[PDB]
């Protein structure tokens, strides 16, 4: 609920398309989000410009990684709310001590969990199988589990591969069972 949704500007009409789920609509009128533009007067299919969608996805991932590694810290005290990029070596039991008031802890503005959840959401908005099993209903699942959508399914799988690749390189997406069980 706190994650940014995928914004893609239509190359033809230039209207923003917000993607938050694999599928849009209800009943037999349900189709993958990247099949039709959000503008009724626009006939352009974003699935045609999947190279552009891939590039925008990579740019967004870079933006979020940059946000995380900016390392912005804010004081948890309402009356201080000191915002600094510098992490001080002076720590209390709870974490870095704010050097403006010397009495409250500095919290990350964009913690690791935020970035992990953002990447997981970008994977979610392209997870065909998960959407079919969980999100979609029975009749909708039947309508979507036929031909006329195989190409869209393949493109969605390719797009999810990008987010999966990024998450495979995250220390927050792998669990080392050797370290747990010894």
């Amino acid at each position: 609920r706190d994650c940014e949704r995928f914004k893609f500007f239509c190359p033809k009409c230039g209207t923003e398309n917000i993607y938050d789920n694999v599928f849009d609509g209800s009943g037999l009128q349900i189709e993958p989000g990247l099949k039709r533009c959000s503008k009724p007067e626009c006939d352009a299919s974003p699935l045609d410009y999947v190279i552009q969608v891939h590039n925008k996805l990579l740019l967004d991932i870079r933006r979020y990684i940059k946000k995380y590694y900016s390392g912005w810290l804010v004081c948890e005290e309402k009356t201080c709310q000191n915002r600094t990029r510098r992490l001080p070596l002076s720590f209390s039991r709870n974490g870095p001590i704010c050097q403006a008031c010397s009495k409250a802890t500095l919290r990350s503005e964009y913690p690791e969990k935020a970035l992990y959840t953002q990447l997981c959401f970008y994977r979610f908005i392209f997870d065909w199988d998960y959407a079919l099993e969980k999100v979609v209903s029975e009749q909708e699942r039947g309508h979507l589990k036929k031909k006329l959508f195989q190409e869209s399914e393949n493109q969605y799988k390719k797009l999810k591969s990008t987010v999966d690749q990024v998450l495979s390189r995250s220390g927050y997406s792998e669990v080392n069972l050797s370290k747990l069980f010894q």
């Binding site: 590694y69 900016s70 992490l87 070596l89 002076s90 720590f91 050097q99 390189r169 220390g171």
Partner: protein, 431 residues
């Protein structure tokens, strides 16, 4: 249009060392041995999991950096005891710490704070008053030792700022005593004009390489710039990986006649690569069997050994990053380069600039400078130069392309044991 009709092709914009003929020729990488500098620490050669930094880990890494540099400096200067920075001091005491700014803006003489390490100061900070220091040069993240007094317990007044101590140079083995002088052509991205994606400057540089047949060609990123106007506005009809693959194929195949060892260094502006520093090497391209021994995908930063000559290189614009924060009492680039060499790190600035993502465990493991390099390649948006800083030849070849107009590259000759004149000659030349 503007680039193709340039008239200053081949002009030598800067020169250093022994004068050479109007034409440079190399050995085509025949009697050449290129490897990564074999030091105690293992090099960065593969991706490391990132995006998971604990604040405690950052604290530990920064603290151990300060502690280790301070230990080396204490042994060198025969300092008896370090004192906690925060405690009051009526008499003169020696304090080890790192410099910083009391606010988020750019450092100035009235906003300097000294933060001590965990061992001697429990990480406490203290404001610094530079009124009694006659000469100084300070940048954030700089590990310093100062003699001073703290009469009020609230403001440290330095009276002496100990100078930096660079690492010793490399003592080459005799294995390469009989090897000839080696030619190195170094260029840095961007490689295409601001309004094109055709890599015309890269083609010209490849032609130069095949013409001069250098022994090593050091290409520093970006190879697919993230700030390229076409990239940002999403006008590209092909994926980023495809463009980068085409560029790398052009570079590798086009250099086949020259037989020149290619050293490819990634850049934080590479839109197709992992945005983290230290940057792992490129791994999306597999050279053909006939080019495997010629292509070296190295990490940013890199310390290379070429017949015993140690070349340090980084794609990061260190000079631009530190020039925006360095404060001095009264050549600025020479001061910054000496700071880099004396801090013994390829990125001593803390906090970093806004344009670089730093993983601090990887920074600790892969940014220490093993020795003081014979040549130090530091491309920058600032003007090209060839400087001699404490016996190290620091070369800024500029960038191959400067907006719509063509840029510059550099060519230098290195021989182990020459005369310390390991750099026979060096030249910044126009493309």
């Amino acid at each position: 249009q503007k680039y193709g009709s340039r008239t200053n092709r081949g002009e030598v914009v800067t020169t250093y060392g022994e004068l050479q003929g109007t034409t440079w020729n190399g050995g085509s990488g025949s009697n050449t041995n290129v490897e990564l500098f074999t030091s105690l620490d293992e090099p960065l050669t593969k991706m490391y999991k990132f995006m998971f930094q604990k604040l405690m880990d950052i604290r530990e890494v920064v603290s151990i950096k300060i502690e280790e540099l301070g230990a080396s400096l204490k042994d060198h200067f025969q300092i008896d005891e370090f004192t906690s920075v925060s405690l009051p001091a009526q008499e003169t005491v020696t304090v080890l710490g790192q410099i910083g700014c009391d606010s988020n803006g750019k450092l100035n003489s009235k906003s300097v704070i000294l933060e001590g390490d965990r061992e001697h100061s429990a990480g406490m900070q203290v404001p610094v008053d530079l009124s009694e220091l006659k000469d100084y040069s300070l940048f954030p993240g700089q590990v310093v030792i100062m003699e001073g007094t703290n009469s009020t317990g609230r403001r440290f007044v330095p009276t002496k700022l100990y100078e930096g101590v660079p690492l010793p140079f490399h003592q080459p083995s005799k294995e390469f005593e009989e090897c000839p002088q080696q030619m190195v052509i170094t260029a840095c991205g961007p490689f295409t004009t601001s309004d094109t994606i055709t890599y015309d400057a890269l083609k010209d540089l490849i032609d130069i390489v095949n013409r001069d047949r250098p022994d090593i060609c050091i290409l520093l990123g970006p190879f697919l710039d993230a700030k390229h106007e076409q990239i940002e506005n999403l006008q590209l009809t092909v994926t980023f990986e495809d463009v980068f693959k085409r560029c790398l194929k052009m570079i590798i195949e086009g250099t086949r006649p020259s037989g020149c060892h290619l050293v490819i260094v990634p850049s934080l502006r590479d839109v197709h690569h992992d945005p983290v520093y230290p940057q792992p090497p490129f791994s999306c391209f597999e050279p053909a069997k006939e080019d495997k021994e010629r292509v070296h995908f190295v990490a940013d930063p890199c310390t290379l050994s070429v017949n015993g000559v140690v070349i340090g290189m980084t794609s990061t614009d260190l000079l631009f990053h530190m020039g925006a924060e360095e404060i001095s009492s009264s050549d600025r680039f020479s001061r910054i380069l000496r700071h880099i060499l004396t801090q013994r790190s390829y990125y001593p600035l803390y906090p970093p600039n806004e344009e670089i993502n730093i993983d601090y465990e990887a920074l600790y493991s892969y940014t220490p400078m093993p020795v003081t390099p014979d040549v130090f390649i530091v491309p920058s948006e600032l003007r090209y130069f060839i400087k001699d800083v404490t016996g190290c030849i620091c070369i800024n070849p500029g960038r191959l392309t400067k907006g719509l107009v063509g840029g510059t590259y550099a060519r230098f000759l290195v021989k182990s044991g020459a005369m310390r004149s390991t750099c026979i000659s060096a030249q910044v030349v126009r493309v």
